[PDB]
Structure 1
Amino acid sequence: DPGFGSLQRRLLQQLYGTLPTDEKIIFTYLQDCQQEIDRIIKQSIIQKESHSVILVGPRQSYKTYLLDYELSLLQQSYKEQFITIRLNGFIHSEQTAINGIATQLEQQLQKIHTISSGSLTEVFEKILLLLDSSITKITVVFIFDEIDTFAGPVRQTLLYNLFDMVEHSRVPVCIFGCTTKLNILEYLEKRVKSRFSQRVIYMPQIQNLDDMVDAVRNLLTVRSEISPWVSQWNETLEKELSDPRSNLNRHIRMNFETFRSLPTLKNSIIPLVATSKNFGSLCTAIKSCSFLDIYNKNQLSNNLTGRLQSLSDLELAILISAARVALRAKDGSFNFNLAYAEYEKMIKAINSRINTIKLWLKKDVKNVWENLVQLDFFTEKSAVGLRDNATAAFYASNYQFQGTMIPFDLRSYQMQIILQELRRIIPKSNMYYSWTQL
């Protein structure tokens, strides 16, 4: 039937939040936060005040979700009243955010009704004396994602001038900064903190298990009659949440104890619904939740236990042999020569007490040695893998490290998985299990 195919499509676009903006789901634990964001936007767009504020919470804490919700709800009532500027501390720099404001200023002002052209000292002084300076004004709303990278230790020019428009400009300038850092005010300079209006509002957190039950209840309830299966779906999902010993309420409880983030459970429900062929299987799959065990097995199937279980016998024997040399060493370090010496005296002691097991040569374990390097079982000794930013990754590419230049079998390595962890994962029926203990 096409009724189920329309029952999937709404129930899946409720799980992405792409409902139109009067049907969008606002959970009850972040209503008092979105009412505080609602008050700030519409006494700056309707009532033309100029205050700034920083939103702060973790990643995937509905900071950009609530700002996109509040502007879209003011989009439909007050379209002509405001232009919106949004920057982002990842893709913008100190130099590039000047071009990003002026490009978005001139293209938002065409839709209601040049600035962006010239040198960078020209394009910055034109957006100043535009902004710094019965008919009413256009209010300009700024949105910052990762304002904490604009609040670096060095200069902080761009945060100085925008907070200087909150205090002194005759243009009403609303500024949202979405950061993650709890100590965001200590990144700011003394001049930049003094201009800022000191309002830093903290995104709410899930406090109870019943907050996640009510928020999954709001995500999986269809509030209109689109399909013949809507009432039959809604009475199934209310039985699965009223029963505390149900399997769906068991997977919510594991999320509350481990992740406590509803977007992580949201990625689990999405292929439980989209990979359901008919309503008979879609009603069954949320009763049993046998997909969420298969999903959670996949997400964690090549982390470090799933890579150790995908090894051959020589790859496991070299991994054990390098884990015994790393336990005797004081620095946890080993070579290819040290780990093949422990390997060959292990294969001797197997074949002496015992048909026989092949001892692979020095030239043949070299391929096994390099695969354990690229599967993150061995790391280079004092190694800095990825750098923080782009200049530190560029400085490291011009330096020629020592372990590159020394020969192959002399490189000191270290150990991702120690021998005491390596005894616990390998089963007791392996012939190499006796060698996971000194």
Structure 2
Amino acid sequence: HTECLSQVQRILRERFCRQSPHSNLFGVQVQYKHLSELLKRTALHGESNSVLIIGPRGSGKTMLINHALKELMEIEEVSENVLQVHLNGLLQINDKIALKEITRQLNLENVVGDKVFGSFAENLSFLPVIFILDEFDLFAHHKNQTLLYNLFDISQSAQTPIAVIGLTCRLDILELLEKRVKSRFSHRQIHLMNSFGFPQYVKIFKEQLSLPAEFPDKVFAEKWNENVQYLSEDRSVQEVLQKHFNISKNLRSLHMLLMLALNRVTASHPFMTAVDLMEASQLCSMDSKANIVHGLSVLEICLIIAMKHLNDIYEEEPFNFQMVYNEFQKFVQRKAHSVYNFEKPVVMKAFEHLQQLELIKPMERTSGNSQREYQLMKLLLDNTQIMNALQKYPNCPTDVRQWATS
């Protein structure tokens, strides 16, 4: 009953949100085998190597390293001799901070010293330790790439064994390095691509939403497996998966969609439904611009229609407030006695509000020399978007609609 739902909710939330390690690996057998073999070579012997892993963000770059480390550290007492250092390009943005983090992680601050002294020969002269470098591309943007060059030098030296691992999303990481470090860099690269077909993606989805064998209740787990297997071949679920697979093959988006689907699981509906997946996909695939347009007012709609008319008459040219005001006046003057008797300040405030929502952006920004009036403004919307949004507008009057059609 309720306890089983709470437990399965906790387990799946841990699986998706925190991305807890799992024994299941997809299409990465050769890459993981190579990486584990080289890690074992670097650990059981004094040899040093340098490897870079390239892949799109959200493709489980960290998972391969974590699984390999969990597999190989606990082999023998080598982990006692093995030391690991983790560096992220976001937290450590300066070489001083990187050096401080390296010293603190090694518990050598007592040996090296506590003060802010810039000397690093305490470690350099003394220098198996493994290095993990998250966002390796950021380190290449430092002033002189001193840390990377020193790491490559000590890797190429015959003093101590050092393993260097870097993570990069850019495919041009080879040209972001200087000639010296590129020459001293051992050209070991591993590429993480989603090289699998749609049926394999369906298998991945079926396995991911499958309860583990360690769940207490076994008959409920078997019924859940039957439900997910039955939901696997449903053509609506397949259509949603096909759409999301056409959009992107990254597993992070699939995890997000599965998490959002599981949110609508209550006591009255212990097992999911294809309509739940349809609702989740619909919620995940809405455009923000149309939503913003829907929440506007009548005056803003009229101003936007005038803006579209300006863009149509003057092909791809900027504009200001005065022309828009003049042609809005033209529109309200052609009509005999429509209730739109508004003064200048309210229209000016409406234009300011529209500019605040960042639907209109200035060109070659300057202030003081040019007022808000007589300022070159441009629209950031498409005509078809305006037509579609106006079609779904709840209470659009006939007059403004016909003006828009004109």
Q: Do they fold alike, i.e. is TM over 0.5? A: yes
Displacement of 1:142 after TM fit?
Answer: 0.9
Please give the per-residue CA displacement for 1:210-262, whole angstroms capped at 9, x wherever unaligned: 23212222211112132352111011111222x1x433222221111012212
Amino acid at match of 2:228: L
Displacement of 1:150 after TM fit?
Answer: 1.7
Please give the per-residue CA displacement for 1:306-339, whole angstroms capped at 9, x wherever unaligned: 1112111111111221232234345521111121
Candidates 106, 131, 134, aligned match of 1:142: 131
2:103 maps to: 102
2:162 maps to: 173
2:173 corresponds to 1:187: no
Displacement of 1:362 after TM fit?
Answer: 1.0
Distance 1:268 1:328 in 2: 44
**Structure 2 alignment gaps of length 5 or more:** none
Displacement of 1:9 after TM fit?
Answer: 2.0
Distance 1:169 1:214 in 2: 48
Displacement of 1:98 after TM fit?
Answer: 1.9
1:363 maps to: 345
2:359 corresponds to 1:377: yes
1:252 maps to: 241
Please give the per-residue CA displacement for 1:179-212, whole angstroms capped at 9, x wherever unaligned: 1111111111111011100112111224311232
Distance 1:404 1:208 in 2: 59
Please give the per-residue CA displacement for 1:384-423, whole angstroms capped at 9, x wherever unaligned: xxxxxxxxxxxxxxxxx52355222222211101445423
Q: Aligned with 1:64: secondary structure? A: helix
Q: Aligned with 2:265: secondary structure? A: coil
Distance 1:287 1:379 in 2: 41
Displacement of 1:117 after TM fit?
Answer: 3.1
2:89 maps to: 89
2:296 maps to: 311
Displacement of 1:73 after TM fit?
Answer: 3.2
TM-score, normalised by the number of residues in structure 1: 0.82
Distance 1:126 1:437 in 2: 77
Please give the per-residue CA displacement for 1:264-283, whole angstroms capped at 9, x wherever unaligned: 121121132133112x5241
Amino acid at match of 1:281: H
Q: Aligned with 2:83: secondary structure? A: strand
Equivalent pair of 2:240/2:281 in contact (CA under 8 Å): no
Amino acid at match of 1:410: Y
2:125 maps to: 129
Distance 2:37 2:57 in 1: 23
Equivalent pair of 2:155/2:161 in contact (CA under 8 Å): yes
Distance 2:73 2:397 in 1: 66
Amino acid at match of 1:358: Y
For the structure 1 residues 61 and 116, does the alpha-carbon distance in structure 2 shift closer, same or farther, using more than 3 Å as the test? farther
Distance 1:219 1:359 in 2: 62
TM-score, normalised by the number of residues in structure 2: 0.88
Amino acid at match of 1:292: A
**Structure 1 alignment gaps of length 5 or more:** 132-138, 383-400
For the structure 1 residues 163 and 126, does the alpha-carbon distance in structure 2 shift closer, same or farther, using more than 3 Å as the test? same
Please give the per-residue CA displacement for 1:61-118, whole angstroms capped at 9, x wherever unaligned: 11122222222333444541322111122232233222222222227x99xxx23634
Distance 1:163 1:430 in 2: 70
Distance 1:420 1:239 in 2: 41
Distance 1:404 1:145 in 2: 45
2:14 maps to: 13
RMSD: 2.6
2:228 corresponds to 1:230: no
Distance 1:169 1:178 in 2: 25
Amino acid at match of 1:87: L
Q: Aligned with 1:85: secondary structure? A: strand
For the structure 1 residues 249 and 116, does the alpha-carbon distance in structure 2 shift closer, same or farther, using more than 3 Å as the test? farther
Equivalent pair of 1:246/1:287 in contact (CA under 8 Å): no
Identity within the alignment, %: 23
